[PDB]
Amino acid sequence: PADLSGTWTLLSSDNFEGYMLALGIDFATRKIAKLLKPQKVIEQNGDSFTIHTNSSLRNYFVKFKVGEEFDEDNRGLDNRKCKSLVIWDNDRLTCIQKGEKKNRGWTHWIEGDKLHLEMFCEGQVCKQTFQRA
Known part of the structure; x- marks a missing residue:
């Protein structure tokens, strides 16, 4: 596991548009x-996470415990429902979102003091890095 806590500001985004297209x-x-x-x-808090995604167009919130399946109604996103599961891929926090869309999910990890994030959906992968505010 790794400590991924903190307030992060998006420093670099990459192929976010491809990611969104894949979502529809x-x-x-x-x-x-x-x-x-x-x-x-x-x-x-241990394996208990609460992740806030704040932005102009919309505020997002996901609360989960590692290894605990939880449904995600994305009616604030693509409105598509998903059954999510987050696990520890060695030091990378990886989520698998089973649903209509295939190979959808995301992965967080930290190297140094920079937060990385990959968000994928059936072929499209959006890479992002954040800096501790």
């Missing part, structure tokens, strides 16, 4: 979303 987000929302610099707040 419309033109209007994608144009606005790609212009955002969302903040990520990670509260970590």
